[PDB]
């Protein structure tokens with residue numbers, strides 16, 4: 001057995017607009033991950049900037065923020081064995097052109113400029129990202 005983990009997932013505005021929330025949810029659920037918190041939201045500039053602070057110096061920072069506030073997102077906490085890595089494996093590489101066939105990014109995105117999904121990349125970032133978007137009373141382990 002591996003540790004039971006929680007990770008923060010975002011279906012970005014591109015995939016929400018494509019109306020493929022359900023298909024992406026089924027990738028998680030069929031992989032053995034459970035949706036334990038969820039909310040559709042529309043991020044403010046400030047919140048997007050805070051959430052992606054780690055990339056504040058990167059050349060893509062401005063574009064990322066404008067993209068993430070361009071329309072509603074679907075945010076969820078995924079729980080299961082090895083959830084953090086499992087989610088990342090389902091998402092695929094940052095660049096959809098380089099992502100493996102069958103990943104969410106390969107299947108639902110075309111360029112790095114709009115790449116469908118976010119997932120926490122480590123235990124530490126998972127904790128911070130979950131607490132950013134959900135109070136613990138609105139996360140329901142099962």
Ligand SMILES: Nc1ncnc2c1ncn2[C@@H]1O[C@H](COP(=O)(O)OP(=O)(O)O)[C@@H](O)[C@H]1O
Nearest residue numbers: 055060063064093094112113115117118119121
């Ligand atoms: N060169 C780029 N141009 C536009 N957006 C980018 C670029 N690189 C990264 N991004 C955006 O910033 C997000 C976070 O970057 P990063 O954490 O490095 O990738 P990942 O989301 O695969 O963990 C990416 O998922 C993507 O939406």
